[PDB]
Symmetry: D2
Subunit: 233 residues, 4 copies
């Protein structure tokens, strides 16, 4: 059993497991059933930006996703992540397709963790994903293509997405997401993405997630489960 915290860019409504009946952004604390969601107008073929922000003093996990034309969606959830995650974690990106499909392309990814100037800190930014990105752990169908972009889920040589794909990219170094001696733990994550499908109803979405160090893809996690959970509890 992996422990999971995640911000989800859910493009396909699986209303049976709690989804609203539209594309949406959500905050997932140890369950695919988001503790809080917001309506999200996904824009086929456009490059969006997700910003995730957490603060251990305020104990609020906040996320906003937006597109160059302005359209944004925002969700927030009161949660003390020091009561959820282990001391050391890995951070990652995941994505899935199912019966409906889409590109799950990452163009850039940034993360910053700070423990507080006796500050422990970790920060990375990736704007070009080389073929052998030695500081990323790729799982499932995730690969890096010839444009220097990360393809979380399978895409054909044409460029057309495929269904029933799962893929995840984890940063190589573990993250001291909190330590006992800290008065301020905090982190911020940013990624830009390109989701494009022929489907007038694409699937399934992208997430940013935090998990225990040794986390691999749970069996039975494609489509609605976003490569994060074994079931829908």
């Amino acid at each position: 059993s992996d422990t999971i915290v995640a911000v989800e860019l859910d493009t396909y409504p699986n209303t049976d497991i709690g989804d609203p009946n539209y594309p949406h952004i959500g905050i997932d604390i140890k369950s695919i059933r988001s503790k809080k969601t917001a309506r999200w107008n996904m824009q086929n073929g456009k490059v969006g930006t997700a910003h995730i922000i957490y603060n251990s003093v305020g104990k609020r996990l906040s996320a906003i996703v937006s597109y160059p034309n302005g359209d944004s969606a925002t969700v927030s959830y009161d949660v003390d992540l020091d009561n959820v995650l282990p001391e050391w974690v890995r951070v990652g990106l995941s994505a899935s397709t199912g019966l409906y499909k889409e590109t799950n392309t990452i163009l850039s990814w940034s993360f910053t963790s700070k423990l507080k100037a006796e500050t422990n800190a970790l920060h990375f930014t990736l704007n070009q994903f080389t073929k052998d990105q030695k500081d990323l752990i790729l799982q499932g169908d995730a690969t890096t293509d010839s444009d220097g972009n990360l393809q979380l889920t399978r895409v054909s040589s044409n460029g057309t997405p495929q269904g029933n794909s799962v893929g995840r990219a984890l940063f190589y170094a573990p993250v001291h997401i909190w330590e006992s001696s800290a008065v301020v733990a905090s982190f911020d994550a940013t990624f830009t993405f390109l989701i494009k499908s022929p489907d007038s109803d694409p699937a399934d979405g992208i997430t940013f997630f935090i998990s225990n160090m040794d986390s691999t893809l749970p069996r039975g996690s494609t489509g609605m489960l976003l490569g994060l959970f074994p079931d829908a509890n």
Copy 2:
């Protein structure tokens, strides 16, 4: 009428104007009557650290003050500061003494503002306050001493604090604390301080504050009013 947002390190309980009956940290939104407070054990003669954190997605102003031995106090307040402050501001530090006194010594001050990589951003750190600090606006009794520390309120050549003192230090450049085109505005401030008095009941406290650009010290603002407000409304 200046517009003021402030985190206050209130060392003296003025219970008539809403104070708890102990030293405390508070969040002040356009009034000395803190919207939220927390018990704070001030430690005479020790160097404390204040950390202030705000996020426009979460709309939570959080603050924590602590000492090297660990003792911390934390307060948070839900407020959308985009609905309170003007677009351009100055950030500052203030402090007062009244009938009871204390040193209000600043040893270091950091600020970071980010508008979101089309990011407008401003960040400064001051660990030594030279005699003519050309990037600080000093108001009232504030001066910089021979140890490279900032003395917000008057201290004699001996080193003994004086009463009925007011002093403020504002950063020279205005701060674009938000702009309309932003999806993420956020800021963080940090300062270390040394509060020392012969009084078994020192007064009055230090604040970090944000205000309109042309803000000067309001008349009638010493002691309990912390150099921020003209009255106690």
Copy 3:
């Protein structure tokens, strides 16, 4: 007499005052006659990036300018800037036109100064130049337009550049570019620009510069003198 250090993007060869017979990048230490230059292929209508880097341990001022297609020009000069500049400075951007013209448009500007975690530090990034940018000091013809870009030299409502223009933009807060107690002083500057002319031989260029605090535009400084020097000595 202002004291000036500058990296120059010289688009027009004024061979009489030391220029090479091509567009070039140069390092200017208290004289328009660059201490060191490099050939630069300016690309009409494209957005370039200039990166300026200095280190007080290595005592090397380095600059590189480049375009999205890759073409770059690099120049370096051994100089101890602690022996040239005053303790407190302002940093800026300037540009000129003369008999030949060009747009001198700034789209983004970043600066970072660090004195060394007892670090004094100042850092700003400007990606949108609002109409009233309260943290920039505009001089001469410099204004901000309706696209959120900074126009160092005059451009007509059409968008066509004009000749005999001078303009400079200085950051509002002075910069502690060095202090005596430092073991490491260092700074880095970045700006992106758009230079466009109908002229098959545009003029005159853009610079990033450091100067004394009270520096205004010297008389007789347009065209080849880049708004920095009173003469060509």
Copy 4:
């Protein structure tokens, strides 16, 4: 054969292999015989700071080490590190004792790498070394003690250093120290250390180093060879 670039804090003069006849700081490019050295007054029992700075435009590797009382030593060497190191590396700290001994205690370590806002970047800061620091690779005698400090070489429960010790600490994630598409590669490293011996002539020193990813401690590298080289060529 590992490829090695290193800044060395050489406390013991091994004059047979090129050392000056005093403690010194040096720049080591693929050989223990420093390309450039500087006199260094090591201060027994005091906490020093080393700052290492490199820039791909200036192609100068610079280093400065200093103590709270001010005494500093500075060395610089013109070298294009893009012509020396592989694309992906690990960064580390090493230290040795031999016939003479000393503590080789690291209290803090920071590193920052930037490829240039299409910036790839990696940055970490470690101010407390927990018992199981999951983001450090420890080699040889390196361990973390009960004060949250890293002990590169063996120290007894008393706190007394031991001779013939070797130890290295490498950051877990590889570092894209340069990529072909970059116009600016650069990095900066900082570490604070405590070197203390009963010996009026302690040995051997601490280094910061960059090496190929799979680098382990070369056989025959203790004492004068600083855990970096197999021989003295």
